[model samples]
Target: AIIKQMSRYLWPKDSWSDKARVLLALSLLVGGKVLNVHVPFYFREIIDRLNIDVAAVGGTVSAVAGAVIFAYGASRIGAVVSQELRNAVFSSVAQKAIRRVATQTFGHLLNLDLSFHLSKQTGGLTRAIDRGTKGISYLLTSMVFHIVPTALEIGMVCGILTYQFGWEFAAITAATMAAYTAFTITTTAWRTKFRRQANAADNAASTVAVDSLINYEAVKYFNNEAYEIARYDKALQAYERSSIKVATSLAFLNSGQNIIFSSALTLMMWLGARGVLAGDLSVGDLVLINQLVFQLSVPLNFLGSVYRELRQSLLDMETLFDLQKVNVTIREAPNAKPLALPKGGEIRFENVTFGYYPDRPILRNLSLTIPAGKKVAVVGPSGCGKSTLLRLLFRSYDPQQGKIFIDDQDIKSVTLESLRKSIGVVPQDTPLFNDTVELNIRYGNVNATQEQVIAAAQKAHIHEKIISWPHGYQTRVGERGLMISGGEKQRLAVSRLILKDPPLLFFDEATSALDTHTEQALMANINEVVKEKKRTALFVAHRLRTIYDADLIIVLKEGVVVEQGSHRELMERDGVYAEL
Candidate 1:
């Protein structure tokens, strides 16, 4: 099951060359183990040769023993060299698998709907993927390159004992191994509960710390330093208790393993000694059996450790696999084509209805149209779906009841990439990457030149502020642009949209962060851009000053359009618009 799940990454369909490399590495692994298996046989020969008379036929015995010793030494070296070469060859396969899973999982998360992102905790989600990818890599390398060969080597050792000694000796070795394995498995299975407890505690502690730190401002505002510390300490206390349980259980497992192995060795050694004393076996024969059993003990011990880790890794990977199974709520149509945008943007919403929850509807049977090259403003009280209009137009969520159209084509039928590319937005809560000021603006159009970025920054009236910094355009905007003032961040967002130069623009309370004077100035620049390009623009505004020049004003209440007209015309009517 594990192999099948990991096979695509290891043996990707597109790369036959990597498949050949893996095959080559496997052959090397087999050859290395085979060479390693012969080393003890040659060592046994040397021991027996030494027990013979040194002065009688001394020269020939020494020569033969010397050759056996050389062979033994060479075999050990060859074993190490072959294994090293195998590791070097297989490293790429392991790394490629890690990269593939990580990239695919990350991309999948990005493509998932916003609801999933909003609901998930950042620390826990990232930890799951981190542990899962590492677990997979470790499992793949250990299971394939270590566990399989170790087991095979154990089997080969048992076969050698049966051939040289009797079934009696082989039976003792095999039975002892069986008992050791059963005990390890039983104890390890019991310890798994503690490991799970530890992991849960660890995750809880991490979440607490990350949550507290990310909301540092809130923590300071509430003066909850003591409270936050208590919460974190409580989480750590759970982790401490679980870790102790894990450690105690681990000690028990290790003690049991050693006891079983030692008992097996004693019985085998006693039997070999009796055979030697009874003249049924040479002294060297006892030594050979001891060496073989000792060699077997190393991997026997290793097998136990590997089994425990493998179990834990399987558990860790389960969450990642489950994440992959999360259904994407929004998907492009099978035959979706790129949006064919008109020079003058025209947008229509026909009977569109939506809500985050099924029962609590936000927009209901809403129908509206903004003519090409016209500016429209939507105003409403909170919870009346003012922001939802822009979200729907951006395809963040699809309407349940009706269709949204761009250039007379149903948006759901168009490719999402092209649909989004034709529109630009300056959202109310502007988000910025932790990067340079220049790169943030250039993000709107990756291929834009430095001059274009500067021009856009200038148009947004943020150029002088940017240049005043010692780093100029290279200044690092700390996480989420926290290093810059809210107004600066909003202007930076405007700079991005100006660089985007999309045919349609949506400003959802865009200038709420700025002072009235700055807001007026920025709006003037925005108006010039919209008018010059003849693009259709939609504004969602609570500040009426920003929307006074709109060609049409739509007043909404309870998901219904209560009024629509020019700003003056609506004010003259003294209806809901005037009251607002």
Candidate 2:
């Protein structure tokens, strides 16, 4: 099942070469392990041959030396070449799997609902993916090439010893291995807690630091730099304590492993010596036994570490895989098609009731129609569901009670991509990417040219200001555009909206952050953009002065439309509009 899941990404749907490469790599792994096991046998043979006197061998010193040297060289060279060949064959598969998994996970994250992104910490999510990718790489390489092959080599060694030497030698080797494994597993299980604690502390410290950094301006405004530092320090201190515990436990595991391995080696050596003295085993056989045990000892020593790393790798993978299990509340319907937009963008909300929670309804049975080719302004106090209208239109969340229609088509029946593409929004909270001004503007319409971008900027009255910067449009707008003023960010947002040029536009207090003069100029440009084409416009405003010229004004109070009319009509009525 795991291989099938991994293979989906590793190999293209129709490609067979990668699968063949995997098979070839597995074959090389077994071949390399076999050659590695034979290396010690060559070493033992060389030692046994060297024990023979030059005179006893009839003074053929050069020939004897040549044979021993060839055996040793072949063993060393063959083992290395085999392993390297295996690595060369398998590298592409491992790297491809890593790339595919990372890409798929990142795409899934992008497709997740807005609620998940809002609630999740940016630092924690990135860390999970980073660790998860590394875990995938490590587990794939180690388990496939090292751990499995090493176990097979140990089995072969034990079987050879039992057949050639006797059951006694084999029994001792097996007992030592069993004890070493038991101790490693038990201690590793205990150490796993410390490992988890250390990881948790590390993630906590990272999250705090990232949060502080992202809110660097806020921290400076409150003069709480020291406070932020102290908070991060506390998290680091917890990390340090857990890390120390992890290190201490690892030291204990290492010492115990060494003790077990040493005892095994000593017991084998003693038994071999006894067999030689009893004239049942030759000197060459004793040497061979020693070499085999030493060879086995190397993997046995690393076995504990590999096991621990494998366990941790599994945990990391589990965390990442769990993210995939997060139910995507907003899902595209099967066979959903592109939205069919008419010449005019007419939006209608019918008896819509919605909220973040069921008990706290933000919009209660609210019904409204935004006529095509007309400007409508919605005025309301905070928490009166002015912003919620824009969200509903955007389909960020579906209404619990009713359907929203754009151009007579229910938004739920159309693909989200098409629905969102047809409408543009200049949100109250303008969040900019930490990128060059040019790129941020270009993000609105990726296919737009430099001339179009500059034109849009000029229309928004930000072109001259952008060119005044040292790097012109190329200047980096620090994190979340913190380097720019609120007014400037809003203007850039307007520039983006102008570039998007969607059929319908929703401005949620788009000019609230700007000064009177700037607001008027920006609003004039917006009016010109929509007025020329008679494009539909919906303005959610708190500032009455900004929407006085709006074709129609609607006053909302507690999720209900208390009054609706042009500015003059509403003011004459002396209702919520006049009071505000």
Candidate 3:
């Protein structure tokens, strides 16, 4: 556990270097503890000299005053170091953490199979990760750095008191300390478990809130107002109950420590007062012992608080820390090189097999070849792996046991960045981000020139429509780009393909949801783009007649290709292709 926790502070980042600053703080804490503990002893000495050594009392008073000043100064330095160290570690964690950690998290959420997203609540995952990050950072600084030092200071003071007093007083102090530690440790453990439960309940409530809000239309249509409210209320009640349980446990533990410590201090005071009354000690000695007890107890109390918080915080930290360790399923081979497209687009899929789950293959030993500069339309019913085929070209999922090549080199043998940078895909569903029409179309083509953006928009027949909008190219579309019509979003996605200017292009029912006239207009724009002799197009269309002019048409059923040929040739075959 020590090695595991310490590793977070040491790798690549400069967080561990701040240990030097903490060491400096430790030096100050020691100096401050010693000087502060001696102040009451100095006071006792001054009193002792008042009657017997009146002439020497002035020098002793001066020495005691000097000790107080030094102790205060040292403590100020320690406070500064602790604050600065906190800021340093925080900034380092923010800046030096691997970018892939957060990027992969979001990408995983995006690329996870549809069934996985359907089975899990998004709010729970998001809240758990966010809370985990905050909890861990606090544990590192507050508990590991500040809390541990405060604890050591308390123990040192107790040991000093034992040496200065007698074996009897030490025994009493030790017994009280043992009881206090046991109560603090056990009760804190119980409270932390409850804290974990509270966090889980809170996440569940958040998930319900998001689910209800997103599906508000359905809820209202079904008149489920009371049902939604009751569900949310139940989750909130669970959270409330768990929080109170933790709070009550912690209170009981702290109160027990107070009772024990107070009793021990009272007994010590009584013993010391008797010694002074019998002339075996001075009045100052009693005062010295009384002040020391409070000083020692004060830091010990904070140390106990730190320990409880640490226990809770570590639990949260472990969750996010584990998230950073996920291995991305798609990665380039160590010796992979960049991929270069052929002079004209050509694609090959050989013995292809892929599945979200290894044993449940979605695409079996499939084979297809599309020549350069050809337009092929793939027709299939739902769940026939048509979308999966498009995903293969987009490289969303890697086939477990097959080779897919563009031009000639296997995609698995090329850098993913190089593999994807030159391929353009228009998925069946056009996801519009919260950006202007032009910016959303140019999402991946970050460095596209203004002229190129305008040209691409013209190719998709969206430039004129966008120019007519009140904000023109600068309009901020609402979330998911819902401000525009579905046809307009599809056209904008097509415009993105033109901006990308890749040799190969894919369109998966991009116009299926559009009105008839709008679909015809979009097809005309696509025809203009695919007219170039060097460009390639592979598309899936629900309206089979829309691709009558396609150079090749393939018909699929039950994950098998039943027919393949040009429109004329497939109709001549009078098979599944002719039926479509």
Candidate 4:
């Protein structure tokens, strides 16, 4: 359905070779068609020459007809070259389309709005992208090379039929062509639902297996191996039923096409017999028609077997391109300006509100301000992602209501790139890359010198710990930082953020896994570093002891700031902060 859409846009037009190679391939296509059509004519003439010469009384010199036979073989070889070389030349262009489309689609998938990822089935989406990109390559090959050439051969055969024989012969041939095409399209389209069902089942089965494996720890803890096997068996059972439907329907399609072509071949031969008896056609003429019909039949038969998948192929592209519709909901303003954190990062959330689900709000009409160059602490219950305050500042999701301002500039009006670079966080989860320790720390400041990386790690109180590893800076963090202990992972994350050197820092429960002694020592180091740079920072502390010396501590309850002030001031008031 979107064939015309691709024809207009997908062809590469970037360089001289793009257009150059295409023209060369197409010229070969037409040339091959003419040579193939000429073969049938040559065969007919050869037969007639032998028939007439042998019927005569003394024509023994017919052995010299090798010239005509030699040319006939040459024409066939020429057609083969046309096919193989055309494919050879167009191969690169075909891959170019795949590369360009795949790269652009991957880019879209990467930056698609966060909500899209959360809501969609990623396993299904992944398969769609895989099958869909491959479908692009197949369509380009079939449409340009196979389908187009078959069409031209049909035209050439019809031309010969009409010119040499009565128009009725051509009429019957054309009618059969029309009927075969309609039948193939109708049957294949009808079978597509089976294809769709099988595809859906495969995705579900794959998703279940992957889901089980990734949650292997949970499965082991719950002792639910039997439950996982049953679920997967249920998925595979559904796949089995749909695939049986696909296989049976294909058998039916192949049988029907055979019947149709054989019936058409029978009708053409009967007409040839009637014409010869009436003296309206020669044996050679009838032979030419038979040769041409069979010539046309071979490719049509090949396409018959192919049509079902090609139909699904186009559908695959249709669904893959459907992803293009998932618009980026968090796009920057059309004329967005870079954020200026000249006031050492002042952040204000003014009457803001948000939630994962609209009816259940997390932060409701809440307003707060963090002044430049202060040690502010955010202490709350399970609003855990630092109570979603840093997310509002980073604009992963813009607040459902109201505005966030950084240094008086509306956060939504600034480029996301510039806004995020000014703020850095040592997150609670702290998932690390499966790479060397040095690269993981260097991730925040990608181009930092080795000496600077060591400095940042020392500043975050992790250099001494890292240096103790057998591989030192080159030690690999296992997938998702699984190989490291909780304390080490958090310290590594802290080192990453210290290297970031942003204007505003959020230390999100980074010391939760540490013992009291380690926590206090790490706290002292972080305190010295923040104070040394005079940076504005929010320490999201769970235990009251960690932020007891904090300059300002704010208490949050159900999305609103219930209390705020110095620790001693809160202790005197005996409000939520003091009670906690």
Per-model TM-score versus the true fold? 0.84, 0.82, 0.74, 0.77
Give, for candidate 4, the lowest lDDT window spanning 10 residues.
571-580
Q: Each candidate: what lDDT?
A: 0.81, 0.80, 0.70, 0.79
Give RMSD to native, each candidate.
6.8, 7.4, 7.3, 7.3
**Over 4 Å off, model 4:** 2-16, 48-64, 88-91, 179-263, 266-283, 301-311, 434-439, 448-482, 514-525, 568-580
- Tens-place lDDT digits, model 1, residues 311-429: 77787777777777787888888889885575467888788778888687898788888888888888876557898887788988878889988878988999888888998999998
Model 2 C-alpha lDDT per residue in residues 259-314, reported as the tens digit of each score: 98888888888888999899987777776787777777765545556776877887
Measured on C-alpha atoms, candidate 1 has an lDDT of 0.81
Clash pairs of candidate 1? none
Better of 3 and 4 by TM-score: 4
lDDT of 3 at 202: 94
TM-score winner, 2 or 3: 2
Using lDDT as the measure, which candidate wins?
1
How many steric overlaps are in each model, in order? 0, 0, 0, 0
> Quick one: how many clashes does candidate 4 have?
0
TM-score of 3: 0.74
How many angstroms is residue 73 displaced in model 2 relative to the true structure, after the best TM-score fit? 2.2
